[PDB]
């Protein structure tokens, strides 16, 4: 149908937009940070992906939980991802965000970012190598390529 | 943070992990360095300098930086002394304290190196520190990578 | 034994205060500082094309742990839990009966990604080069599910990377 | 010859037995014993009492002029009475010496605090009662830091468990984050590592 | 002039991929117009290429196939699809291309490399590995 | 044994009047900055169990550093140290009802 | 026969540690007076 | 590698969810990762190799890259000697 | 680098440095990926004869602290250590 | 034919043995049901027709494996089946305030929820639970309620 063609163009259209512009958040509690600062450096810059870190959570589109998530920190972080305007993703990074790590066993310690805010890509490493998380930000990219927002508007 | 991208290749030449490496244990270090590592290493020192004096011109001495630093966060040698402070912080009031030279650990006895030492005890002070420190490790990997003795990594 | 950062006194003559003068007005340090950016700017960029172009790395690498085979085929691993011992995150669970041949192999062997550190023990324990850290590093998963490795996910990794384990571990079994 | 042990300094160990002894004697009515580690290292040990006026000696210039608090911790031990032994680190730097001081507690003790005397201990303090349950009489403002606000039990106490008794979790219902009992999907697994055999016949307890 | 050599560089890069069109396609496909010695290529279709006048990082790359497994690989590429046997030279683990060094052949080993499979039908479900440990009783079928 | 704030029950019970009545009138403000859903009744009725809780005490020593606990969480209140989570973590909401007759425990599980 | 990563024999070449910041510029008399000059010139 | 009578590939362990069993639902949109090769079956491909002394030792092959070297005695004819960690297995000639 | 000679001499002019002579980026000077397979020594107590252990057991050395004063049952002022000698300045630049 | 016995204290990685498909998970009252289901340790298998960005929320209600998300499409059966095939509890909260082009009342109230209940019944679902308005009436005069009625009916 003309209409389903129109509405694929233009769901391509806006996926490639935000896919090609992500604004991670500057958001880094532990060692993590240090190998998200390293992609940031100049070997692997994200800003070449159209990747660039706006501190503002209302000026951000995904959020990095770079470091290990502590009970006290939890509330701030469930706080800022409220206060992120939508469409937004989350991409956990470090073993101790996905699942706690080496402190999973620790009674200040949330085992796993996914309890407190959904997570979309989970960046294994421990830290996670700068390539890696380029590679699970470009995997959020594809990820965005795949939705069809639009196509199940005009199927309804 | 190119330079530390060089450095963490070096970590990862000898354990494997760029950062948060195992090397270092209790009766010595895990693993010999792989073949090659050591004149990689003179290749980076022999040019580091270089990068530090583009940072020293950048910073240190720029109004502006000067403006931002030079008489903040002063602190008194005895007040340093008794809120516990320690390296620069100590060193930058003045006080001439380094572990290194005054209680050596390893082999710190067997090189050679000058402590920076601070005049005022501020934030530019301890910059002036920080930037010598780093040219006097330079200086302390130049020695120990001339006078690396044969044999063997870990307690037999 | 110790330098003296900073304790530097300026000169006063006439030449040294109209320099100075000059620098505080005419901004010549600024000018210097900005020099510096402007031949950074003319300097070749050290960014590398990913994907198209990987950053290096040395046979020692630590990434996706992958349970190895003998030339034969036989799994290597016997069963020792020598691994789930000095795992320092307790992220190996093994469990092991005897098979039908007899052999002492693992019923279940898990390895959960979301808890281990990638410290590289293991692959420095296993008493016959069973579980070794393959190069692997790009292995990122879109549930926390995926993560929780099984016998069969570490055994296909095993042999979809076998054949640079191997010549990974020959570059540095010397050193080992 | 014998590369694998460690080089002995005996003229330090003489030093510090010495100084041992001149603490010893300037404040024996603290002082309850001094003893060197072979590894030169000094312990003077210490009735609760005196923590502020041997602490205090230790730092003015009778011939010590420990300025600096390395660091400030307690070890839990449950057999003993007084389960907390409070211990003090102090470096000397005129004499590039550091010595170790050590006192007990109980629970419901409390021990006077070292503010007034080395000012470092404010945060050392606060730490050792949110971890271990001791309360420092006097301090400028107790209060938890290393721990949630919320925080009941004193964790490092040999008696609160690693995993704790709540776990939070964010809930959708009351659009909060929410404790909740603590309910490990994998139970941390005890492992019972200690031979079975002497390992050092040097350090062996009496029978009994 | 230097810069008459390098426009005609720039002309010798449009030249070697191809012409126009194939320059513009490697420059929609991999931002790069590097032409440099093609050291092989695996099954896959992936072109592996050195130039080792250009500095550590970019001597060697990889232009990735347009069909890899039933995917169309034109445009989504990763890191992934590189086959085990040419990633230790791409990542600079080895410097002997598997050409010249071939993998050893073992029989377990996989002969077709698979990307990444997460978010497919083919992604990884985890699962117990061990058997029922308690059986419980079966009642009798007969009245009694 | 030595006095940590009193020398006598009556003392660390005169303390314990104080801590209430600070903890009384706090709970209006907490309610009104925290932005609780909870009644001003229903907070101070928390209060009043919290209280009753530690009642069986017959020790000064153990009434006192109760006491010293009991402002260290009142001073975390009166700031906004504590969030809405921390405040709320006294109402047990989330959590479902243990029953506690022994027909009840031996039909859920094998717990004591 | 022993193979390690040891220095080459004689050791590596000595690696620059110091601070090089140049000396660059004119004097100040000569600043100003160039300045001078060309608003000298730029009024006539 | 067999097939269930659910339709499920059974694992080298054996493993293979019941009718009865939900776990089954994990894979319902999904796959089953199950490793074709099995241990077993390429453990007894393997020809047995005949050596004429009574003790015999196995490394697993490549030295330093294989197993701890063990001896195995084969003075049995019955049953041949097979390796403990290898699984090689080893007789006596005749 | 690939640098005209023109963008070197206006980087260089630029910098107040020969940036030519050192460069931030990599080339051949880089130690080969493939090295020749090593041999590590061994060590002290890897000897066949006068190696027991006894002679070098580290740990079993080790004793109990030596108690010095115990309550439990002229004389020249001590101090822990010698004093600290002062520092001196270093030779190679004494002021930065 | 899916018998789980109860296991746990009740929590979030206790095992209540309610396997359970909640159709219209992303509602406002599933938001809630699968909550609880998921702090109870039942299997959740959602069936979601949106994009799974929707769907994202109700992932940390469950711990790890208990919420499934499966896409089905609400006129095709097979899809009913395979996402109520080993669930013992079927939740039915399929329901539109207003009408919509491809889907009518009658499609959402009637058809959905009776090939959902039907479908259950095949597979050997043993409880179901279907919602509809107390207003909801054979002879109510709004179409969506009398639709309601029809499907409770037909249910
Ligand atoms: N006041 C109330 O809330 C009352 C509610 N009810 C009934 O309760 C149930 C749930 O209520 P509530 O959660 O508030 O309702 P919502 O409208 O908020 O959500 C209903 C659910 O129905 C799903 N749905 C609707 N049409 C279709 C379709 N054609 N195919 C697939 N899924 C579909 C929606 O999925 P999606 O969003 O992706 O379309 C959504 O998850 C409904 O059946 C409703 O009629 C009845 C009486 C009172
Ligand atoms: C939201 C509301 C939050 C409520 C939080 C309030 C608190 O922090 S409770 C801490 C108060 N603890 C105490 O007062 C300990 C008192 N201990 C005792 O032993 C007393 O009961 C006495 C001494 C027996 C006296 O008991 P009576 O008050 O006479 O009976
Ligand atoms: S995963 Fe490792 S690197 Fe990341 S925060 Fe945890 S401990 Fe640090
Ligand atoms: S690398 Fe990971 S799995 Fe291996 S021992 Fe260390 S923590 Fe355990």
Redesign the interface.
């Known amino acids: 149908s003309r209409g389903e063609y129109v509405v694929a163009k233009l769901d391509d259209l806006v996926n490639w937009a935000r896919r090609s512009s992500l604004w991670p958040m500057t958001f880094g509690l532990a060692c993590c940070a240090v190998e998200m600062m390293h992609m940031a450096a100049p070997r692997y810059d994200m800003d070449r992906f159209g990747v660039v870190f706006r501190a503002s959570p209302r000026q951000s589109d995904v959020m990095i939980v770079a470091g290990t998530l502590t009970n006290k920190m939890a509330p701030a972080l469930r706080k800022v991802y409220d206060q992120m305007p939508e469409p937004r993703y989350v991409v956990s990074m470090g073993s101790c965000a996905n699942g706690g790590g080496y402190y999973h066993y620790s009674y200040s310690v949330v085992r796993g970012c996914d309890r407190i805010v959904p997570v979309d890509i989970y960046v294994p490493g421990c830290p996670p190598t700068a390539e890696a998380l380029l590679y699970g930000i470009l995997q959020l990219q594809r990820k965005i390529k795949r939705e069809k927002r639009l196509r199940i508007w005009y199927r309804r | 943070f190119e330079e530390r991208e060089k450095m963490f290749e070096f970590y990862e030449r000898v354990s494997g992990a760029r950062m948060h490496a195992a090397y270092i244990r209790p009766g010595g270090v895990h693993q010999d360095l792989p073949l090659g590592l050591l004149d990689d290493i003179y290749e980076f020192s022999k040019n580091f300098s270089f990068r530090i004096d583009e940072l020293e011109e950048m910073l240190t001495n720029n109004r502006i930086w000067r403006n931002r630093t030079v008489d903040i966060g002063v602190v008194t040698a005895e007040d340093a002394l008794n809120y516990g402070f320690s390296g620069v912080m100590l060193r930058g009031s003045g006080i001439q304290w380094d572990l290194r030279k005054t209680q050596p650990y390893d082999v710190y006895d067997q090189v050679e190196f000058d402590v920076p030492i601070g005049s005022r005890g501020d934030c530019y002070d301890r910059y002036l520190c920080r930037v010598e420190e780093m040219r006097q490790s330079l200086r302390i990997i130049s020695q120990c990578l001339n006078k690396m003795p044969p044999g063997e990594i870990k307690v037999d | 034994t110790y330098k003296f950062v900073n304790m530097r006194e300026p000169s006063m003559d006439m030449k040294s205060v109209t320099d100075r003068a000059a620098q505080t007005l005419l901004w010549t340090e600024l000018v210097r500082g900005l020099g510096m950016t402007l031949s950074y700017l003319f300097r070749e960029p050290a960014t590398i094309n990913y994907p198209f172009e990987k950053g290096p790395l040395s046979p020692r690498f630590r990434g996706e742990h992958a349970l190895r085979r003998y030339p034969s085929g036989e799994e290597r691993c016997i069963a020792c839990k020598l691994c789930e011992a000095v795992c320092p995150a307790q992220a190996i669970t093994i469990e092991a009966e005897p098979r039908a041949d007899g052999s002492r192999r693992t019923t279940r062997y898990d390895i959960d990604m979301t808890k281990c550190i990638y410290c590289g023990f293991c692959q420095e324990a296993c008493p016959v080069d069973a579980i070794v850290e393959g190069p692997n590093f790009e292995f990122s998963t879109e549930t926390h599910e995926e993560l929780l490795y099984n016998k069969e996910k570490l055994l296909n990794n095993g042999d979809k990377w076998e054949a640079e384990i191997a010549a990974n571990i020959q570059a540095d079994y010397l050193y080992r | 010859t014998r590369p694998t042990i460690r080089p002995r300094n005996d003229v330090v160990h003489k030093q510090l037995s010495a100084f041992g002894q001149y603490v010893a004697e300037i404040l024996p009515k603290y002082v309850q014993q001094v003893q060197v580690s072979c590894f030169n290292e000094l312990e003077i040990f210490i009735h609760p009492d005196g923590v502020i006026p041997v602490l205090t000696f230790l730092r003015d210039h009778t011939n010590a002029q420990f300025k600096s608090l390395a660091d400030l911790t307690a070890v839990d031990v449950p057999t003993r009475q007084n389960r907390f032994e409070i211990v003090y680190n102090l470096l000397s730097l005129r004499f590039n010496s550091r010595i170790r001081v050590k006192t007990y507690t109980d629970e419901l003790t409390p021990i006077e605090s070292s503010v007034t005397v080395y000012k470092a201990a404010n945060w050392y303090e606060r730490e050792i009662w949110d971890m271990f349950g001791v309360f420092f009489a006097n301090h400028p403002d107790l209060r938890r830091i290393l721990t949630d606000y919320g925080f009941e039990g004193h964790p490092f106490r040999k008696d609160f468990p690693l995993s704790g008794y709540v776990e939070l979790r964010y809930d959708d219902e009351v659009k909060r984050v929410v404790a909740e009992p603590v309910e490990l999907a994998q139970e941390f697994r005890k492992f019972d590592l200690n031979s079975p055999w002497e390992a050092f016949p040097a350090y062996r307890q009496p029978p009994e | 002039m230097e810069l008459v050599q390098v426009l005609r560089r720039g002309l010798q890069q449009v030249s070697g991929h191809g012409g126009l069109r194939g320059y513009l396609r490697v420059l929609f496909r991999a931002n790069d117009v590097r032409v440099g010695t093609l050291v092989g290529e695996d099954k896959y279709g992936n072109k592996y290429y050195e130039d080792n006048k250009q500095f550590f990082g970019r001597h060697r790359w990889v232009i990735y196939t347009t069909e890899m497994n039933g995917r169309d690989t034109f445009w989504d590429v990763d890191g992934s699809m590189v086959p085990p046997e040419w990633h230790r030279w791409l990542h600079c683990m080895t410097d002997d291309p598997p050409t010249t060094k071939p993998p050893t052949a073992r029989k377990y080993i996989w002969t077709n490399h698979k990307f990444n499979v997460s978010g497919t039908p083919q992604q990884y479900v985890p699962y117990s590995t061990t058997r029922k440990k308690i059986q419980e009783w079966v009642p009798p079928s007969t009245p009694y | 044994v030595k006095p940590i704030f009193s020398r006598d029950m009556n003392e660390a019970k005169r303390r314990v009047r104080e801590l209430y009545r600070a903890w009384y009138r706090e709970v209006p403000n907490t309610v009104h900055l925290f932005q609780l859903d909870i009644s001003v009744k229903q907070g101070r009725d928390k209060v009043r169990e919290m209280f009753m809780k530690n009642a069986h005490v017959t020790d000064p020593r153990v009434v006192d550093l109760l006491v010293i606990k009991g402002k260290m969480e009142l001073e975390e209140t009166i700031n906004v140290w504590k969030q809405r989570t921390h405040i709320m973590r006294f109402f047990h909401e989330t959590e479902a009802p243990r029953p506690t007759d022994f027909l009840s425990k031996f039909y859920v599980g094998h717990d004591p | 026969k022993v193979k390690q990563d040891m220095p080459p024999p004689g050791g590596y070449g000595p690696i620059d540690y110091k601070r090089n910041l140049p000396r660059r510029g004119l004097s100040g008399y000569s600043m100003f007076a160039v300045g001078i000059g060309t608003l000298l010139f730029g009024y006539w | 590698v067999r097939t269930s009578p659910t339709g499920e590939k059974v694992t080298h362990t054996g493993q293979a969810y019941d009718d009865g069993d939900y776990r089954r639902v994990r894979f319902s949109d999904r796959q089953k990762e199950v490793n074709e090769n099995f241990a077993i079956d390429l453990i007894a491909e393997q020809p047995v190799s005949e050596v004429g002394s009574r003790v015999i030792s196995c490394d697993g092959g490549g030295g330093a890259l294989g197993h701890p070297r063990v001896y195995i005695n084969l003075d049995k004819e019955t049953k041949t000697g097979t390796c403990g960690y290898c699984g090689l297995q080893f007789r006596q000639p005749h | 680098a690939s640098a005209t000679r023109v963008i070197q001499l206006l980087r260089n002019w630029a910098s107040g440095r020969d940036l030519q002579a050192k460069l931030q980026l990599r080339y051949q000077e880089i130690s080969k990926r493939t090295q020749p397979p090593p041999k590590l020594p061994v060590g002290p107590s890897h000897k066949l004869s006068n190696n027991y252990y006894c002679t070098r057991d580290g740990r079993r050395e080790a004793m109990p602290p030596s108690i010095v004063m115990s309550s439990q049952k002229e004389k020249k002022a001590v101090t822990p250590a010698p004093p600290i000698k002062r520092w001196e300045l270093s030779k190679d630049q004494p002021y930065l | 034919?899916?018998?789980?016995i109860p296991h746990?204290?009740?929590?979030?990685?206790?095992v209540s043995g309610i396997?359970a498909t909640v159709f219209g998970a992303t509602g406002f009252l599933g938001?809630?049901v699968v909550?609880?289901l998921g702090?109870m340790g039942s299997?959740v298998?959602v069936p979601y027709?949106?994009?799974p960005?929707d769907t994202?929320?109700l992932?940390?209600?469950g711990?790890?494996?208990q919420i499934?998300f499966?896409?089905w499409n609400g006129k095709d059966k097979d899809s009913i089946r395979?996402?109520v095939?080993?669930?013992?509890v079927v939740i039915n909260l399929v329901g539109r305030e207003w009408e919509?082009?491809?889907?009518d009342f009658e499609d959402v109230f009637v058809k959905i929820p009776h090939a959902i209940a039907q479908v259950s019944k095949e597979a050997g679902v043993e409880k179901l639970i279907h919602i509809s308005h107390l207003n909801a009436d054979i002879k109510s005069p709004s179409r969506y309620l009398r639709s309601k009625a029809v499907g409770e009916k037909e249910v």
């Not at chain 10, 095939?85 to 013992?88: F, G, I, K, R, Y």
């Open positions: 034919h899916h018998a789980l746990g204290k009740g929590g979030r990685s206790s396997v938001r809630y909550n609880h702090r299997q298998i027709r949106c994009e960005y994202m929320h992932r940390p209600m711990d790890l494996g499934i499966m896409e395979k996402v095939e080993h669930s013992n919509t082009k491809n889907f």
